[PDB]
């Protein structure tokens, strides 16, 4: 899709490896049922999740279809990390190994427009589960969006980063078909900006539980936060499980 075109430069500069980070790490590993059977992430991108994750669990296999995505965490790779990449498609990606656990993070499932193709990247997703793994699955929260929208098709806001001169600038759109479009300015200290744009779809957990029924999967209870937070309508994120 050119997700990797649009942000794989300058990727871990929005989002980085900082604390944000280290939760989901301690949270997936959590909920990890067995190491010793294998772990499989659904858009790995730079590794900012497998290469952290694979220093407790061991070896991961990331599949992604960015191959720019798969360069920035090759790159990585020579320092740190036990991550085995792979080229493909959520929506496609098929494979005779099971793995204990199976999880698609960062609103990469949202990446996909349409109902139909994130139904089919959960069916995937199933395939992929060994008996007793779990499936985890992590994406932005619909209602604070619509929130902030308040009403309007298009808004703006900035996120100021930590180091000075730093943050980012986002153009908010709301579309038909529960589609999100966001273009987001990246303000570096040095004086230069990069900008991406991404298309999303705004997901739920209750057309994610939807898609894990039809797989054949039972939902375990839906979190707000990766430290066990119950859902709710407020916070960015939010986590669906599933055995
Ligand atoms: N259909 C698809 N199949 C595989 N990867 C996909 C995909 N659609 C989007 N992606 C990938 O999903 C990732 C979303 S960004 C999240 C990256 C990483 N999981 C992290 O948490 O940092 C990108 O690397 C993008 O290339």
Not at 31 to 55: F, M, Q
Not at 182 to 194: E, P
Request: charged residues 20%; hydrophobic residues 35%.
């Amino acid at each position: 899709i050119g997700y990797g075109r649009q942000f794989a430069g300058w990727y871990d500069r929005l989002i980085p490896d900082d604390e944000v980070t280290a939760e989901a790490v301690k949270g997936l590993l959590a909920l990890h049922p067995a190491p010793e059977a294998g772990t499989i992430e659904l858009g790995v991108g730079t590794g900012r999740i497998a290469v952290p994750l694979s220093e407790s669990v061991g070896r991961v296999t990331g599949v992604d279809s960015s191959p720019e995505m798969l360069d920035a965490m090759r790159v990585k790779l020579k320092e740190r990390g036990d991550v085995t990449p792979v080229h493909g498609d959520i929506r496609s990606y098929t494979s005779d190994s099971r793995y204990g656990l199976v999880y698609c993070v960062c609103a990469t499932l949202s990446l996909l427009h349409t109902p139909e193709d994130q139904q089919l990247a959960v069916r995937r997703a199933a395939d992929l589960l060994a008996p007793g793994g779990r499936l985890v699955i992590e994406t932005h929260n619909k209602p604070p969006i619509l929130e902030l929208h308040e009403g309007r098709k298009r808004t703006t806001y900035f996120v100021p980063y930590p180091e000075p001169g730093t943050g980012v600038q986002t153009h908010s759109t709301l579309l038909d078909g529960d589609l999100w479009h966001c273009s987001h300015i990246l303000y570096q200290a040095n004086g230069t900006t990069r900008v991406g744009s991404e298309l999303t779809r705004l997901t739920t957990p209750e057309e994610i539980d939807a898609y894990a029924r039809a797989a054949g999967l039972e939902p375990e209870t839906h979190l707000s936060r990766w430290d066990g937070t119950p859902y709710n309508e407020q916070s960015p994120m939010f986590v669906c499980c599933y055995v």
